[PDB]
Design a protein around this ligand. Structure first.
Ligand SMILES: [Zn+2]
Ligand SMILES: [Zn+2]
Length: 73
């Protein structure tokens, strides 16, 4: 019990408000920013997930396959 820290994964700080959940994690409404552009999202947006990064629906399209992936098995 008792309050302390149990929410965000980037900063590891509880989140009172909404949390950006992508796949199986949770982050703050500011901590998690599209790696491509880095524009905050809403409290329930839909985007493509890869490994552990947040890729926008329009952004990803561009960063689909650009010198990314050393080993392709
Ligand atoms: Zn955070
Ligand atoms: Zn973006």
């Amino acid at each position: 019990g008792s309050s302390g820290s149990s929410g965000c994964d980037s900063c590891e700080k509880y989140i009172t408000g909404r949390v950006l959940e992508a796949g199986e994690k949770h982050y703050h409404p500011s901590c998690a920013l599209c790696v491509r552009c880095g524009q905050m999202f809403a409290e329930g947006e839909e985007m493509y997930l890869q490994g552990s990064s947040i890729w926008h629906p329009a952004c990803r399209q561009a960063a689909r396959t650009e010198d990314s992936g050393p080993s392709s098995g």
